[PDB]
């Protein structure tokens, strides 16, 4: 089951912002692969400012680093990945959402589909 992810990570360090994001991406990707899963794409997005001053437990955030991870897994695995994301202090907002494979097998991320490229083959070419 192809699940897209959107995590808005924390950026504490000013000079080197992407490090925490990169670590998060590594860890969640590691979890996925240990657990019968297959990460397809890890689309980065920019250091984008949040719409409002969004706050985690005993913290506050105005800017964050955004990224999509487009992975396959079981439902239980995914649910648990989501839970771990919710638990951790270095992400502000997390959101897993299903990508339906009833018609196709190759499906790109939501952003790529919006641009034009339906399958990841198109992106490759």
């Amino acid at each position: 089951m192809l699940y897209e992810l959107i995590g808005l990570v924390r950026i504490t360090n000013s000079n080197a912002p992407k490090l925490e994001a990169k670590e998060l991406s590594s860890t969640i990707g590691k979890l996925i692969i240990q657990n019968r899963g297959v990460v397809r794409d890890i689309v980065p997005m920019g250091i984008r400012y949040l719409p409002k001053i969004m706050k985690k437990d005993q913290e506050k955030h105005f800017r964050a680093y955004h990224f999509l991870m487009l992975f396959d897994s079981s439902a239980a695995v995914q649910s648990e990945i989501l839970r771990t994301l919710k638990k951790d202090p270095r992400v502000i907002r997390s959101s897993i959402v299903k990508v339906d494979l009833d018609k196709q097998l190759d499906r790109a991320s939501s952003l790529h589909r919006s641009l034009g490229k339906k399958s990841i083959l198109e992106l490759v070419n």
Partner: protein, 142 residues
């Protein structure tokens, strides 16, 4: 240090009464980058002159009228002029669409708020609404 960046003119205009409030945005010139940026975003304010249209001797019902509201606005403007909080720029905000709101804006436009207008950088409404929330009172029969 205590540097006044700008003033904010707040006006809460309810059904029955107006509340005009002047306040200085006090920035200190003097830690993590994110924390500093957050501080810069939401600078502390200090109240300078509070005012409500009963302060101008309008008792009970007459304080829910713009005539009282207009007078209060004029008094506020006079206080601003005299007490000397006109050196930096001003930011107007409003609430709750009363009669007094209409009076306040008219006062600002006219000669009563002549000295203030030139420092007023931005008008910016901030009325509160609810996306569901607490249930309101039952609609009075009358």
């Amino acid at each position: 240090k205590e540097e006044v960046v700008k003033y904010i003119l707040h006006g809460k205009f309810t059904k029955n009464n107006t509340h005009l409030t002047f306040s200085s945005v006090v920035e200190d010139k003097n830690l993590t980058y994110n924390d500093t940026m957050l501080y810069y975003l939401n600078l502390p304010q200090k109240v300078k002159i509070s005012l409500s249209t009963g302060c101008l001797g309008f008792r009970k019902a007459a304080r829910g009228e713009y005539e009282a509201a207009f007078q209060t606005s004029g008094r506020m403007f006079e206080l601003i002029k005299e007490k000397n909080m006109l050196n930096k720029d001003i930011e107007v905000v409003m609430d709750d669409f009363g009669k007094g709101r209409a009076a306040f804006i008219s006062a600002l436009v006219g000669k009563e708020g002549a000295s203030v207008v030139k420092k007023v950088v931005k008008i910016s409404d901030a009325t509160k609404l609810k996306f569901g929330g607490v249930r309101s009172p039952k609609m009075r029969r009358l």
